[PDB]
Amino acid sequence: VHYARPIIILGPTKDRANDDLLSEFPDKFGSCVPHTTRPKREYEIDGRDYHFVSSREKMEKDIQAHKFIEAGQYNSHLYGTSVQSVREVAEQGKHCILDVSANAVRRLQAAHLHPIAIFIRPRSLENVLEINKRITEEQARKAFDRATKLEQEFTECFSAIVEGDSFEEIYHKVKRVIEDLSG
């Protein structure tokens, strides 16, 4: 089996693009599961909702030993996506579709996992409204501002920058981008 590079899509509509790749090509795209020290709720399922960690000290040590591409605290419990969880998907020859922040890109590269980082760049506020038709003007201005700051601060880590007048255009480009950079 050949290693498949993990994927981090960023920018407006990245979550729709993530869901679409998984639902269209389940043979080439997969997901991994985050870790948490929060205790498991009865209905939750270990290895499915989270990898539930019983020792907060254990997770703290692993975070400091760089075992996570992303980690943080909420409601006094730890949360993170582990290097190994990405590696397992990649080793099985599937692109791991990651829903992580841009700071994870550098951590994935430093962990030698060779990510594909794709930035969907809005051309303007109006372009945001073209490609996401379910949001208010305010939400679109917030998305546009976030994308401007994202590009200003993280443009050096992008594998590809994609643009378009509709989500369909962006999605076709995203798929074509992944095929070009994987071969």
Binding site: D15, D19, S31, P34, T36, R38, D49, Y50, E70, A71, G72, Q73, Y74, N75, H77, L78, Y79, G80, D99, V100, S101
Partner: peptide, 14 residues
């Protein structure tokens, strides 16, 4: 497949 707990932990207000 959003995990709201996870997103709050990893996207803290700065």
């Amino acid at each position: 497949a959003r995990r709201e707990s996870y997103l709050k932990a990893t996207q803290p207000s700065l």
